[PDB]
Ligand binder design. Sequence first.
Ligand SMILES: *[C@H](C)[C@H]1/C(=C/c2[nH]c(/C=C3N=C(/C=C4\NC(=O)C(CC)=C4C)C(C)=C\3CCC(=O)O)c(CCC(=O)O)c2C)NC(=O)[C@@H]1C
Ligand SMILES: *[C@H](C)[C@H]1/C(=C/c2[nH]c(/C=C3N=C(/C=C4\NC(=O)C(CC)=C4C)C(C)=C\3CCC(=O)O)c(CCC(=O)O)c2C)NC(=O)[C@@H]1C
Ligand SMILES: *[C@H](C)[C@H]1/C(=C/c2[nH]c(/C=C3N=C(/C=C4\NC(=O)C(CC)=C4C)C(C)=C\3CCC(=O)O)c(CCC(=O)O)c2C)NC(=O)[C@@H]1C
Ligand SMILES: *[C@H](C)[C@H]1/C(=C/c2[nH]c(/C=C3N=C(/C=C4\NC(=O)C(CC)=C4C)C(C)=C\3CCC(=O)O)c(CCC(=O)O)c2C)NC(=O)[C@@H]1C
Ligand SMILES: *[C@H](C)[C@H]1/C(=C/c2[nH]c(/C=C3N=C(/C=C4\NC(=O)C(CC)=C4C)C(C)=C\3CCC(=O)O)c(CCC(=O)O)c2C)NC(=O)[C@@H]1C
Ligand SMILES: *[C@H](C)[C@H]1/C(=C/c2[nH]c(/C=C3N=C(/C=C4\NC(=O)C(CC)=C4C)C(C)=C\3CCC(=O)O)c(CCC(=O)O)c2C)NC(=O)[C@@H]1C
Ligand SMILES: *[C@H](C)[C@H]1/C(=C/c2[nH]c(/C=C3N=C(/C=C4\NC(=O)C(CC)=C4C)C(C)=C\3CCC(=O)O)c(CCC(=O)O)c2C)NC(=O)[C@@H]1C
Ligand SMILES: *[C@H](C)[C@H]1/C(=C/c2[nH]c(/C=C3N=C(/C=C4\NC(=O)C(CC)=C4C)C(C)=C\3CCC(=O)O)c(CCC(=O)O)c2C)NC(=O)[C@@H]1C
Ligand SMILES: *[C@H](C)[C@H]1/C(=C/c2[nH]c(/C=C3N=C(/C=C4\NC(=O)C(CC)=C4C)C(C)=C\3CCC(=O)O)c(CCC(=O)O)c2C)NC(=O)[C@@H]1C
Ligand SMILES: *[C@H](C)[C@H]1/C(=C/c2[nH]c(/C=C3N=C(/C=C4\NC(=O)C(CC)=C4C)C(C)=C\3CCC(=O)O)c(CCC(=O)O)c2C)NC(=O)[C@@H]1C
Lengths: 160, 160, 197, 161, 161, 161, 161, 161, 161, 66
Amino acid sequence: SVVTKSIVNADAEARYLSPGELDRIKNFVSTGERRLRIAQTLTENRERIVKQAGDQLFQKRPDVVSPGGNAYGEEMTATCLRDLDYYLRLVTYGIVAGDVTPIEEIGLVGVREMYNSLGTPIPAVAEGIRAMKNVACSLLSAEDAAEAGSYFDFVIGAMQ
Amino acid sequence: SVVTKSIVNADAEARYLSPGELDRIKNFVSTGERRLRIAQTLTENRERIVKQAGDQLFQKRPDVVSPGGNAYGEEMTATCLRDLDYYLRLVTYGIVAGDVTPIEEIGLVGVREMYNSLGTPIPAVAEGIRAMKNVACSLLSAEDAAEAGSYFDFVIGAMQ
Amino acid sequence: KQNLQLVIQAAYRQVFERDVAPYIVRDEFTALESKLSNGEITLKEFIEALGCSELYQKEFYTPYPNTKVIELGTKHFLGRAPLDQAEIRRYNQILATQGLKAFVQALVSSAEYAQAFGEDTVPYRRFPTLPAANFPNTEKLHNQLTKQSDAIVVPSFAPVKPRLDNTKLPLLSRAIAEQEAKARQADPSKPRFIELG
Amino acid sequence: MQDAITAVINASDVQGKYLDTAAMEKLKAYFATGELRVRAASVISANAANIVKEAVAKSLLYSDITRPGGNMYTTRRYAACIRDLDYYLRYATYAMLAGDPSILDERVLNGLKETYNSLGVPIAATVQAIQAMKEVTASLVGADAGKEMGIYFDYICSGLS
Amino acid sequence: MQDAITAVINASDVQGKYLDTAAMEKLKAYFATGELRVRAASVISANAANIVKEAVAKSLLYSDITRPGGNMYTTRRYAACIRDLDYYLRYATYAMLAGDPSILDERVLNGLKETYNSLGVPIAATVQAIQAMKEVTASLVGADAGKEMGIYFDYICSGLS
Amino acid sequence: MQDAITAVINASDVQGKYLDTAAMEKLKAYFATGELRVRAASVISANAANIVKEAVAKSLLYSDITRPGGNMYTTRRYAACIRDLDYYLRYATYAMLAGDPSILDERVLNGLKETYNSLGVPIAATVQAIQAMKEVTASLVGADAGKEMGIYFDYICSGLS
Amino acid sequence: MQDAITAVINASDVQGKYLDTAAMEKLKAYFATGELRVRAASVISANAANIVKEAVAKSLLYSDITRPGGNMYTTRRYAACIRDLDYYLRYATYAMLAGDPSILDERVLNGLKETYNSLGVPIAATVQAIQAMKEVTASLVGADAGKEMGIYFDYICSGLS
Amino acid sequence: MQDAITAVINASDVQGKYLDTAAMEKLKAYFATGELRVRAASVISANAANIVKEAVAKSLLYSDITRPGGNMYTTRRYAACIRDLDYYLRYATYAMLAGDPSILDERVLNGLKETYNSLGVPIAATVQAIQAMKEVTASLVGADAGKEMGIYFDYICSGLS
Amino acid sequence: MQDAITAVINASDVQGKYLDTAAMEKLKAYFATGELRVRAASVISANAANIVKEAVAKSLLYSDITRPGGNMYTTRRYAACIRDLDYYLRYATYAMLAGDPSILDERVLNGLKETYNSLGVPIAATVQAIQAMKEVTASLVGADAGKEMGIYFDYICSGLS
Amino acid sequence: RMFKITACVPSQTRIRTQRELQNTYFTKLVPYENWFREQQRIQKMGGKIVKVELFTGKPGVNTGLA
Ligand SMILES: *[C@H](C)[C@H]1/C(=C/c2[nH]c(/C=C3N=C(/C=C4\NC(=O)C(CC)=C4C)C(C)=C\3CCC(=O)O)c(CCC(=O)O)c2C)NC(=O)[C@@H]1C
Ligand SMILES: *[C@H](C)[C@H]1/C(=C/c2[nH]c(/C=C3N=C(/C=C4\NC(=O)C(CC)=C4C)C(C)=C\3CCC(=O)O)c(CCC(=O)O)c2C)NC(=O)[C@@H]1C
Ligand SMILES: *[C@H](C)[C@H]1/C(=C/c2[nH]c(/C=C3N=C(/C=C4\NC(=O)C(CC)=C4C)C(C)=C\3CCC(=O)O)c(CCC(=O)O)c2C)NC(=O)[C@@H]1C
Ligand SMILES: *[C@H](C)[C@H]1/C(=C/c2[nH]c(/C=C3N=C(/C=C4\NC(=O)C(CC)=C4C)C(C)=C\3CCC(=O)O)c(CCC(=O)O)c2C)NC(=O)[C@@H]1C
Ligand SMILES: *[C@H](C)[C@H]1/C(=C/c2[nH]c(/C=C3N=C(/C=C4\NC(=O)C(CC)=C4C)C(C)=C\3CCC(=O)O)c(CCC(=O)O)c2C)NC(=O)[C@@H]1C
Ligand SMILES: *[C@H](C)[C@H]1/C(=C/c2[nH]c(/C=C3N=C(/C=C4\NC(=O)C(CC)=C4C)C(C)=C\3CCC(=O)O)c(CCC(=O)O)c2C)NC(=O)[C@@H]1C
Ligand SMILES: *[C@H](C)[C@H]1/C(=C/c2[nH]c(/C=C3N=C(/C=C4\NC(=O)C(CC)=C4C)C(C)=C\3CCC(=O)O)c(CCC(=O)O)c2C)NC(=O)[C@@H]1C
Ligand SMILES: *[C@H](C)[C@H]1/C(=C/c2[nH]c(/C=C3N=C(/C=C4\NC(=O)C(CC)=C4C)C(C)=C\3CCC(=O)O)c(CCC(=O)O)c2C)NC(=O)[C@@H]1C
Ligand SMILES: *[C@H](C)[C@H]1/C(=C/c2[nH]c(/C=C3N=C(/C=C4\NC(=O)C(CC)=C4C)C(C)=C\3CCC(=O)O)c(CCC(=O)O)c2C)NC(=O)[C@@H]1C
Ligand SMILES: *[C@H](C)[C@H]1/C(=C/c2[nH]c(/C=C3N=C(/C=C4\NC(=O)C(CC)=C4C)C(C)=C\3CCC(=O)O)c(CCC(=O)O)c2C)NC(=O)[C@@H]1C
């Protein structure tokens, strides 16, 4: 969260929070209701976001669903859709927190290594999350879509 | 090479070459005939090793040559076989050198970075080189195959 | 370049206690300044730069009290445990008023780092001898694996009240007897001596 | 390290469920209280040294401890004592800003009583001193922010005790 | 590093006079373009790897430089080239967000030309490659933001040349 | 750290005796089995990642541990788990090459149970995982070498218990 | 670290009084004895190697301790043992010069017990060795100085035991 | 560091071609001479102290350089001079074993001129001394080996000059 | 407390398997050796007093330990020392009869270190004494039984040290 | 404000069999904060400070320092 990041930096430099950091958390506090509303609509539409974004991802990357691909067969495809659902959940967490700290702490620290042990391609995971971003942005209002899409953008950038 | 690696270690500890190290240098030089013979076999059969092993790789991993894959199209598949050709060349160099430092110096330092930038699957490259090793077993006698196999083993192990 | 990659990785192993592939999103270190360049040619600077970094902060400053930060810092950079309460106090001043960057900078700049490890050596597990409590403390620090405990092996060095009171010791006792007895006795070089009580 | 928001989302993350309405309610409550938290932190940042000075005078001065042989006597020991009070006040404002006492347990109260026992510092007198700090800081930040500062100051006292 | 606001304030500070009316106008202009800067940064952060990949393919691949003896041949040298391009793109976005080229000067260009010359890096090839990056990133962010982006990419080109 | 030869000569040194005929026996036996050890080490060095991959799939995946709230859940903890398996396999190959389990006790199993208990890692689940590794690595190296790998994988299991 | 003078003034400082006439008498006594201390230090500093040699020969040699598997066997351990004996003699003469045993407790005997237990060093054998050192050094410095070196050597013995 | 094999394969790598029969011939030639290189290395390893001693006596000693004010005067300076000669001979034997001058060029010669000029060490005298070393080592190893060594000694001389 | 049989069945119980054929082979081996154990116990039980007497005479007597101020001086302490030696011999033969050292670790060596450190007993002197006991008891029971009594005596020595 | 420096470190304390050229003559980028502390340490060590440059930063800047 923004509050914990400000406290962490202040603790590292052994000084009380500067008025700039205090103003930063104050403005974040003010926009908290909008953040919660964005997370609420995302979780309300979580099922269709995952479903149709996954279909777009398969079209974008046919090799994934081709024989020999990581998500070959209905069982493997089901688990990949589960991963997409997990990342949507992390994105809602991050929007509520106001920082990418929860997303990083839960599903971006060692993401490369976990996927290489699994055998799964990280860039293809990024493409799937891009599809989720498109669906979520369509569901959201223009102002709301900019914020939530930015969180999706961080996730895909880390995947790359 | 064995000579240069021994010299490097002796250089670090500030010692003239130990009598045992001198024996190893002498032995490697003398068996250089066998080393050159093995390398000569591999360069004589560069065409079939790459061609047969690459076809085995494509069959084992259809997703790489599938549409929306890294190797789709004859142009891309030609470049893929070119990469396998490069690695076989490095292996012959390593056999001649008697050490894997030429192979590492040329083509295993940063393969993950390069191949991820290209989009190529690093485990798939490893499986292709495994195919080259299996093809090599028939071409080389059992005693000879063990010697070349170790260099192939280092390449695949670094790749994964 | 082969050795340079080994030494870069070794600096990770000593400073962060493990290879950092788990626990980092992306590799957040540009080793190019150290490699074939003079920007961080000083490993005395590459180690310090890693120490300043967020990863060290998250791993060893964020989760532990400053006392444990000091013990871990001397393990990670100087290869030993805090020598005595003097270093505990100095580094606590620095951690109190200037933070992690200054504390790591102080450890690496210290004449101890330079004398033992030097400009061009990744710091290594040192087996100290001369400082008296330092060796047992150092073994206790190094035997622990990472994140084993929340306890501070070297909490602080306790002062001790000596059991044997001096001015009972043989030399002072002789002298105290002499000064007392000679004072009560007659005094040389004085006119009046029978008057004094 | 955790805060109110991080604790709520982590609690839901363990389940793996998306944020439900009760979790949203807890987050809303923290957002509602956040503005006064920010104001209180800005206030005691301004008066940090003065708060320490007032508390030290209130309980730690003109007493045997600062008189010879009392452990606050000696100029070094006086500097160390006021440094610890600075530490406690700064971590108290961290905990108040976060809305969680995890910082106090993680960075203050772990291995603190043992070090104080080894040093010879009186844990009781430190607890009294930070209680005085609690009074002064509550007056400066106001009553409700004073309640919030108080719970974390009491947390520190309990850890020392 | 100096922001546009930081540079303007610094000039006023050197004079010792308060912010001039022209200084206020400069600050207003930077604030006017700031939101566009934020949007462009978000866009190329998401597509950073793709931008580098496209530029490398456009000019650096299937050429003599990547063929043996051309300085991009060998796995380590190819990895160094691609990470240099991502360095250039990342510092370019820092400069675009800042509204000033100070970051490029202090953290990028210094010693870069001399070290490239010592290594044997083809500076002309790198300049053409980052020009290709400029084209790709301009398409992604938009013409207006791309035109602003180009001045900093060209600044990198001039320092390299 | 020790090996078979070092252990034999160290025991003889402790008893202040030149190498016995029984000590010479142990040395000969190690030399007879040594080439087999070297070949096995080469095999699992090449397939180290694959062995970990299979074992993780065969006992640690699609289970309550990797589902939320089961410790292996979270990408951090998954990376830590697979890294620990690579640690165990690498130290097992060290022990097999040496012909002595002293490496395992001195560098792996000292404090490992204590750390795992503090972390919350399931010692039972790690033991199951490395037994799965034992099966996979036995298949790759062969029966004779697989026996040798087993007497060190089981050693690690017993230490974890 | 403390001296006889430093201890006297520190005691008076704890009470908060300027140096009393009784404190002055203690200080005067130490000054009277200082020359004798300096002489004794000059003697054993010259004969430090001889003192260690004689003590080692009298108690530590031609026994199982310095034959295979005895903790003094191996040249590394023999060097370490004689180095520890010179450590003890050097700090003992520091304490004799100071007229205070605070040196020994602060430096020599802080965890020395624990180190020797860890290392496997026989505490009893070290105590015997420094007892032999005490006999030799007492003979060298004379009776009155020897009973001063004796108390510090026995203090070290008690700390070890 | 580079050697004959490394140079041959490096040239082939720049060519982008597999090992040609001409390249194999070059490797065969290096193998043919490797036998003599090994025994020459053994000889001067054993006699390295004698070689340095003889060269120092031949040119460096009984001169104003080792007389006061000559920069070789002072025991520290003399030790440094013979240390440098040991360095040169050891690196020469490394280059002779390798069959390549890369080790000299990179590990030794670069920066040596700057350090020697800054310190005031006479490069002319060093060149003369290593020339004397070359003569002595040629006598000890033999004529054919002396040809092999002398080129590397001259390479070092040129670098110093 | 455990036996060889109890240890075998407890290991099988931990795995949750009925006694395997390998477990049966261990049990059968212990049964085969039981008669030899019973014989050895019958021997040393009869000679327990003699074993203690000889060991005390060989190592503990006519030394400073049993002369004024030596920890064995005073009849109370002499009785305690010989009582501890009979304790060690009695538990050693219990462990020999059982075929398991769990008796020694559970009973003999639980805090025995700490008690002796508190009491001031010299650990090294006790270890020497029980070493002498080991020599005497090995001679009485014979070579094969002696090497069984020997391991348990050495286990006690290691616990003390 | 990284300072590019060129310096020597001759050492009379010991004679070193292992490589010493690397430490002896070097050029390093020292930040503005570190430079005073490092300058004092190297000056105390007695090495000659051959060259100094302001590699990063500007010769004088009131605010906006790196
Ligand atoms: C003196 C010439 C100037 C001055 C001083 C002043 N000091 C105080 C209060 C305290 N001073 C001390 C000092 C020490 N404590 C130590 O342990 C030592 C070393 C042995 C020293 C020197 C302490 C502890 C206090 C606190 C009160 C106490 O002792 O309990 C005051 C009172 C401050 C107040 O307003 O409360 C003053 C005024 N004032 C001057 O004008 C002089 C220039
Ligand atoms: C003041 C209210 C009381 C007091 C304090 C006193 N404390 C010390 C020494 C230390 N205190 C700490 C505690 C902390 N370190 C931290 O980093 C933090 C925040 C994370 C805390 C709370 C530590 C580590 C020390 C020792 C190291 C040091 O000197 O800083 C002393 C000094 C004791 C000594 O003589 O060495 C004193 C005097 N003294 C009082 O009388 C008050 C009741
Ligand atoms: C084949 C087994 C797999 C595969 C690979 C693939 N690679 C590329 C492109 C390149 N590969 C290299 C490789 C090297 N450069 C080196 O210096 C060395 C060491 C000597 C190696 C191995 C390079 C440089 C390129 C870039 C193109 C170029 O050479 O200029 C491609 C083409 C990607 C594209 O779209 O352009 C492919 C497909 N693909 C597979 O499916 C296999 C699993
Ligand atoms: C890619 C466009 C071209 C290319 C590049 C190449 N560069 C290097 C080595 C270095 N690159 C840098 C660059 C930076 N370092 C930084 O900290 C930053 C941040 C602003 C940048 C941009 C540096 C300093 C070096 C030297 C240090 C080092 O060796 O790493 C290499 C490696 C050369 C080698 O032989 O190993 C290469 C290949 N090469 C090309 O062919 C492209 C045209
Ligand atoms: C998805 C778009 C792509 C893909 C993925 C894929 N993943 C798996 C298996 C697993 N994925 C995870 C992921 C996570 N665990 C976490 O804790 C988190 C953060 C909260 C994440 C993201 C895990 C643990 C597994 C292992 C199975 C399990 O959960 O037990 C598979 C199955 C792999 C297999 O063969 O077993 C696949 C296929 N596949 C694709 O094609 C997409 C590009
Ligand atoms: C995988 C089979 C299981 C599992 C593992 C898991 N482990 C950790 C953390 C640590 N593991 C170690 C162990 C070692 N350190 C070493 O150096 C070596 C070789 C000498 C070993 C074996 C250590 C020290 C840690 C802690 C420090 C660290 O993070 O590396 C975790 C992380 C726990 C956490 O949340 O912090 C996990 C998850 N988890 C499973 O579910 C498997 C049963
Ligand atoms: C013989 C060639 C020369 C010589 C030697 C000499 N040595 C001693 C006494 C001791 N020697 C040792 C040696 C070792 N201890 C070790 O642990 C090891 C490594 C395995 C070695 C080599 C030791 C410990 C002693 C001390 C006595 C003892 O062992 O208990 C003596 C006796 C000295 C005396 O007067 O007491 C001698 C004479 N003497 C010569 O003339 C030869 C040139
Ligand atoms: C002397 C009692 C023993 C001895 C010595 C001996 N020395 C040499 C030659 C040289 N000695 C030096 C010494 C120094 N150079 C210094 O700068 C300093 C410090 C100021 C010292 C002490 C040097 C430089 C030489 C070399 C010749 C020269 O000065 O140019 C010799 C001659 C060796 C030869 O064969 O050439 C000898 C014999 N010899 C003994 O028998 C004594 C035990
Ligand atoms: C002897 C032939 C001449 C001579 C030499 C002399 N050299 C130094 C000091 C240094 N020499 C070096 C050179 C090297 N360092 C290396 O690591 C290697 C191997 C790669 C070489 C060749 C260096 C770095 C130094 C300085 C650091 C150091 O002390 O090692 C001195 C000392 C100068 C001083 O006073 O500080 C001397 C005297 N002197 C002569 O008269 C001969 C002509
Ligand atoms: C004499 C009147 C009778 C006698 C005695 C005898 N005693 C011993 C040996 C020892 N005696 C002691 C006695 C004590 N230890 C104490 O702490 C105290 C209290 C202060 C006493 C009385 C001890 C410890 C021993 C052991 C040897 C030693 O001291 O080191 C012997 C020697 C036995 C032997 O063969 O070794 C004898 C002969 N003998 C007689 O004939 C008298 C009737």
